[PDB]
């Protein structure tokens, strides 16, 4: 009997990035069930403020059984739901690419417009024509957000949801 909503611990040792869903394994380290292994998955948040783990398929050694008590993760020694990782993965890359494409287009067109009032003409040429295609392609690729990624050496806490036997 495990009560409805109590506390347990596990260790995460195999890392993954939050890109493709799949099975992920942890090992329960203390309490009633010893040597137990739990495979589950994750979810993708649209916002980069936290990251949590969907753990569903439990296995207890000794007896060859597979119960499916589902539980989630909390961050150890902070007792929060966030993941300790980086959230600035892909900001400045697309920022600099888009702004460079824009500044290229602006250089060519405005230094073309400043002609009335050969090398600088070729500068106008290159900037005026490589600004636009890179601008529309940067607006195309600007939509991919910053990813989060778990570590291969961090424990985790597991809070129960239902009772089992």
């Amino acid at each position: 009997i495990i009560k409805t909503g109590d506390i347990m611990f596990a260790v995460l040792d195999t890392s993954v990035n939050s890109d493709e869903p799949g099975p992920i394994l942890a090992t329960i380290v203390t309490g009633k069930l010893k040597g137990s292994k739990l495979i589950g998955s994750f979810n993708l948040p649209s916002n980069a403020d936290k990251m949590v783990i969907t753990f569903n398929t439990m296995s207890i050694p000794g007896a060859e059984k597979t119960i499916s008590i589902s539980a989630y993760a909390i961050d150890p020694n902070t007792a929060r739901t966030a993941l300790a990782s980086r959230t600035n993965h892909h900001y400045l890359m697309r920022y600099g690419s888009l702004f460079a494409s824009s500044f290229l287009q602006g250089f060519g067109n405005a230094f073309q417009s400043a002609n009335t009032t050969s090398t600088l003409e070729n500068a106008v040429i290159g900037l005026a024509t490589v600004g636009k295609a890179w601008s529309q392609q940067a607006q195309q690729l600007f939509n991919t957000p910053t990813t989060v990624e778990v570590y291969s050496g961090t424990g985790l806490g597991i809070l129960f949801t239902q009772d089992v036997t």
Binding site: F9, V29, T30, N77, A79
Partner: protein
Amino acid sequence: GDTGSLAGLQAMADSKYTRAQKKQKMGKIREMALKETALSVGAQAGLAWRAKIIDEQLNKQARNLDAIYDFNSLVLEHNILPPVLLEGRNTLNLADAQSIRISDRTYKVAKQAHFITTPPTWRQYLWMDYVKPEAPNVTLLPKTKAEKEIWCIYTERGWKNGIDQANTILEENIARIKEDFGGMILYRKLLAMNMVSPPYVSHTDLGVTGDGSEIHIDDRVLRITALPELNVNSAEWRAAVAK
């Protein structure tokens, strides 16, 4: 506080206690988590350490235990363990109202005599098991020195508790082996007192036996037929004297 009740009530009439209780509420809410884990690790560490120390002491002083506990002197001529006897004096029972049942003394056969191969030793009664744990895991780490101090003292109290539990188990085993030794020596003394029948055991001997493939040169089958028991005829009881 409530001991200086009127002073505490007039202090609570001020709102300074109302602004002071909001932090001690969070303190007692966060307080209880560390104590159980500290008590658990202290209990395991103190129990293991005290058990290792007391087994070291037992291994040091093993010789006189063998000197005092001569089970081999207690056996009989057909290698049979003597039965266990218990005695009691000045018994009474107020079982209910309008009823008192008293008696002078009582004797009870605890464990029946049986055959044996080797005499038991004290090591089957007094050696404590020892599995040292070397796996410390922390639920919530101490951050403040106050929570580190209460974690330390609760670990120390768990160490003391494990010490007490080891002493309790040792004392119960001491009482158990002393009970068995007293029962055997009381059986011997009561047999001398001529209150208990000796065991009676017959023998049946057969010579060569078996088929053409198996032979046994001489076999003897020994079987106890009359178990010891107490008697009811009082006249056959020789008492004692001293000088």
